[PDB]
Design an enzyme around this catalytic site. Structure first.
Site, PDB file in Angstrom:
ATOM      1  N   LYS A  75      45.118  33.006  45.926  1.00  0.00           N
ATOM      2  CA  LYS A  75      43.879  33.406  46.567  1.00  0.00           C
ATOM      3  C   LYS A  75      42.519  32.650  46.489  1.00  0.00           C
ATOM      4  CE  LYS A  75      41.733  34.288  42.242  1.00  0.00           C
ATOM      5  NZ  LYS A  75      40.549  33.436  41.784  1.00  0.00           N
TER       6      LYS A  75
ATOM      7  N   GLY B 172      47.304  27.692  35.824  1.00  0.00           N
ATOM      8  CA  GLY B 172      45.867  27.672  35.762  1.00  0.00           C
ATOM      9  C   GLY B 172      45.379  26.949  37.287  1.00  0.00           C
TER      10      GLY B 172
ATOM     11  N   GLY C  85      45.062  31.885  40.925  1.00  0.00           N
ATOM     12  CA  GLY C  85      45.484  33.323  40.705  1.00  0.00           C
ATOM     13  C   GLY C  85      46.885  33.500  40.781  1.00  0.00           C
TER      14      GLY C  85
ATOM     15  N   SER D 215      48.549  36.008  37.905  1.00  0.00           N
ATOM     16  CA  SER D 215      48.306  37.244  38.653  1.00  0.00           C
ATOM     17  C   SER D 215      49.148  37.701  39.983  1.00  0.00           C
ATOM     18  CB  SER D 215      46.706  37.425  38.800  1.00  0.00           C
ATOM     19  OG  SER D 215      46.192  37.235  37.722  1.00  0.00           O
ATOM     20  N   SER D 216      49.145  36.708  40.835  1.00  0.00           N
ATOM     21  CA  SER D 216      49.781  36.849  42.080  1.00  0.00           C
ATOM     22  C   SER D 216      51.284  37.212  41.731  1.00  0.00           C
ATOM     23  CB  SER D 216      49.761  35.882  43.224  1.00  0.00           C
ATOM     24  OG  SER D 216      50.650  36.159  44.264  1.00  0.00           O
TER      25      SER D 216
ATOM     26  N   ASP E 117      42.573  39.999  38.068  1.00  0.00           N
ATOM     27  CA  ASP E 117      43.035  39.278  39.167  1.00  0.00           C
ATOM     28  C   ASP E 117      44.196  39.933  39.957  1.00  0.00           C
ATOM     29  OD1 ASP E 117      41.619  37.056  37.736  1.00  0.00           O
ATOM     30  OD2 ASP E 117      41.860  36.266  39.590  1.00  0.00           O
TER      31      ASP E 117
HETATM   32  N1  ADP Z   1      54.072  33.103  35.952  1.00  0.00           N
HETATM   33  C1  ADP Z   1      52.898  32.627  35.430  1.00  0.00           C
HETATM   34  N2  ADP Z   1      52.423  31.749  36.289  1.00  0.00           N
HETATM   35  C2  ADP Z   1      51.319  30.936  35.981  1.00  0.00           C
HETATM   36  N3  ADP Z   1      50.504  31.252  34.929  1.00  0.00           N
HETATM   37  C3  ADP Z   1      51.107  31.969  34.093  1.00  0.00           C
HETATM   38  C4  ADP Z   1      52.287  32.864  34.172  1.00  0.00           C
HETATM   39  N4  ADP Z   1      52.770  33.730  33.210  1.00  0.00           N
HETATM   40  C5  ADP Z   1      51.609  33.655  32.293  1.00  0.00           C
HETATM   41  N5  ADP Z   1      50.689  32.516  32.696  1.00  0.00           N
HETATM   42  C6  ADP Z   1      49.622  32.167  31.981  1.00  0.00           C
HETATM   43  O1  ADP Z   1      48.379  32.294  32.673  1.00  0.00           O
HETATM   44  C7  ADP Z   1      47.578  30.932  32.663  1.00  0.00           C
HETATM   45  C8  ADP Z   1      47.443  30.888  34.138  1.00  0.00           C
HETATM   46  O2  ADP Z   1      47.177  31.947  34.910  1.00  0.00           O
HETATM   47  P1  ADP Z   1      46.850  31.607  36.497  1.00  0.00           P
HETATM   48  O3  ADP Z   1      46.576  33.193  37.172  1.00  0.00           O
HETATM   49  O4  ADP Z   1      47.567  30.615  37.107  1.00  0.00           O
HETATM   50  O5  ADP Z   1      45.197  31.292  36.285  1.00  0.00           O
HETATM   51  P2  ADP Z   1      44.137  30.671  37.194  1.00  0.00           P
HETATM   52  O6  ADP Z   1      43.443  31.884  37.800  1.00  0.00           O
HETATM   53  O7  ADP Z   1      43.174  29.762  36.592  1.00  0.00           O
HETATM   54  O8  ADP Z   1      45.044  30.016  38.388  1.00  0.00           O
HETATM   55  C9  ADP Z   1      48.253  30.211  31.562  1.00  0.00           C
HETATM   56  O9  ADP Z   1      47.267  30.002  30.661  1.00  0.00           O
HETATM   57  C10 ADP Z   1      49.621  30.789  31.551  1.00  0.00           C
HETATM   58  O10 ADP Z   1      49.981  30.650  29.992  1.00  0.00           O
HETATM   59  N1  QBI Z   2      35.175  39.824  35.490  1.00  0.00           N
HETATM   60  C1  QBI Z   2      35.886  38.735  34.399  1.00  0.00           C
HETATM   61  N2  QBI Z   2      35.097  38.375  33.166  1.00  0.00           N
HETATM   62  C2  QBI Z   2      35.503  37.771  32.292  1.00  0.00           C
HETATM   63  O1  QBI Z   2      35.025  37.412  31.222  1.00  0.00           O
HETATM   64  N3  QBI Z   2      36.794  37.183  32.693  1.00  0.00           N
HETATM   65  C3  QBI Z   2      37.518  37.315  33.732  1.00  0.00           C
HETATM   66  C4  QBI Z   2      36.939  38.232  34.707  1.00  0.00           C
HETATM   67  C5  QBI Z   2      37.629  38.536  35.833  1.00  0.00           C
HETATM   68  C6  QBI Z   2      37.977  38.575  37.041  1.00  0.00           C
HETATM   69  C7  QBI Z   2      38.483  39.075  38.420  1.00  0.00           C
HETATM   70  N4  QBI Z   2      38.910  37.890  39.100  1.00  0.00           N
HETATM   71  S1  QBI Z   2      38.041  36.847  39.718  1.00  0.00           S
HETATM   72  O2  QBI Z   2      38.896  36.014  40.440  1.00  0.00           O
HETATM   73  O3  QBI Z   2      37.146  37.611  40.637  1.00  0.00           O
HETATM   74  C8  QBI Z   2      36.996  35.884  38.419  1.00  0.00           C
HETATM   75  C9  QBI Z   2      38.215  35.299  37.406  1.00  0.00           C
HETATM   76  C10 QBI Z   2      37.836  33.522  37.714  1.00  0.00           C
HETATM   77  C11 QBI Z   2      36.573  33.670  38.269  1.00  0.00           C
HETATM   78  C12 QBI Z   2      36.372  35.011  38.962  1.00  0.00           C
END
Ligand code: ADP
Ligand code: QBI
Length: 283
Positions: A10, A101, A105, A108-109, A141
């Site tokens: 996303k 990271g 997302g 979360s995806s 997310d």
């Molecule tokens: N399947 C996965 N893919 C990516 N990150 C994961 C997964 N399972 C757990 N994590 C954890 O979540 C974090 C990254 O989440 P992610 O949604 O990739 O973050 P971001 O929104 O910053 O891209 C990492 O710290 C990692 O330890």
């Molecule tokens: N609402 C939040 N508060 C926090 O303290 N932590 C995480 C939160 C969340 C969320 C929904 N995801 S998001 O993509 O919209 C958001 C995450 C990266 C920047 C925007």
């Protein structure tokens, strides 16, 4: 039989921080759009009740992996309501293209794709609302990915109003730095007072990301990537970073900029998608 399931990235096309709840989370106004680009998750059913992620994600332990946590949570929720066929299990593999990271997302995806796929494959019959409710326990997310549509998000990100923003082409760049999400959200200087406004107002206003000023100041690598892209196109942080994206009207222009890009932008080009590839696969 093996089934394959998209797990798209996303973008937060805009992001405004409107306040903070007692439990720490921030209330925001944001606009989520998927990219037609992401991970691919392959699932083979098991008949012995086991859940096995066969392909590790770098730096993530098996039981900490959102893939495994989602699968176990669906299995526990389904079994507690009598909705789990006896012996239901899975072998899960992922071809991971999204940085761990970065604000795209990916984790979360991954969780959302697993919840949706295994709900179908195990025949748990859980509703969209029920899957999104369980998804929210794994991350704010996760519900947007479960529900599958571009959306204006309020609350902490789970109050989702479907909208159809223009499906631009994006050059998504990953600065060479890992930004833990809590760092940004703990910064004293983060806006937490941006006025809450209507979608019409936010669609006419220039899009911005309230986290960008802090990410740029604190992480020189993000400032460098954003400064480079800003010469070519409107460009912004997504999420809390580190990923940055530049917006183009055509695929041709986006790819020409990517061709010019130094390797330290670590770029790819993808089209926005108002319907999640996951849900297009489910049809
Ligand atoms: N399947 C996965 N893919 C990516 N990150 C994961 C997964 N399972 C757990 N994590 C954890 O979540 C974090 C990254 O989440 P992610 O949604 O990739 O973050 P971001 O929104 O910053 O891209 C990492 O710290 C990692 O330890
Ligand atoms: N609402 C939040 N508060 C926090 O303290 N932590 C995480 C939160 C969340 C969320 C929904 N995801 S998001 O993509 O919209 C958001 C995450 C990266 C920047 C925007």
């Amino acid at each position: 039989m093996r089934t394959q399931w998209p797990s798209p990235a996303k973008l937060n096309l805009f992001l405004y921080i409107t306040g903070q709840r007692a439990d720490g989370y921030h209330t925001l106004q944001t606009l989520f759009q998927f990219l037609d680009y992401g991970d691919t998750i392959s699932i083979e059913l098991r008949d012995d009740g086991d859940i096995r992620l066969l392909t590790p994600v770098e730096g993530v332990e098996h039981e900490d992996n959102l893939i495994v946590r989602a699968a176990r949570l669906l299995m526990k929720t389904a079994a507690d309501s009598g909705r789990l066929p006896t012996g239901s299990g899975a072998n899960i593999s992922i071809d991971k293209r999204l940085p761990v990271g970065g604000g795209l997302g990916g984790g979360s995806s991954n969780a959302a794709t697993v919840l949706v796929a295994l709900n179908h494959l195990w025949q748990c019959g859980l509703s969209m609302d029920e899957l999104a409710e369980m998804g929210l326990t794994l991350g704010a997310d996760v519900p947007v990915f479960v529900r599958g549509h571009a959306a204006f998000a309020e609350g902490v990100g789970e109050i989702l109003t479907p909208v159809d923003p223009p499906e631009k082409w994006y050059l998504v760049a990953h600065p060479g730095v890992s930004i833990p999400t809590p760092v940004i959200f703990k910064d004293p200087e983060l806006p937490r007072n941006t006025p809450k406004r209507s979608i019409e107002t936010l669609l006419k206003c220039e899009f911005s990301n309230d986290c960008e000023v802090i990410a740029r100041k604190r992480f020189r690598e993000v400032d460098a990537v954003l400064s480079w892209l800003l010469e070519y196109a409107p460009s912004r942080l997504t999420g809390t970073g580190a990923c940055v994206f530049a917006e183009f009207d055509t695929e041709s222009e986006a790819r020409q900029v990517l061709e010019q890009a130094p390797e330290w932008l670590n770029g790819f080009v993808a089209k926005g998608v108002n319907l999640s590839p996951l849900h297009r696969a489910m049809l």
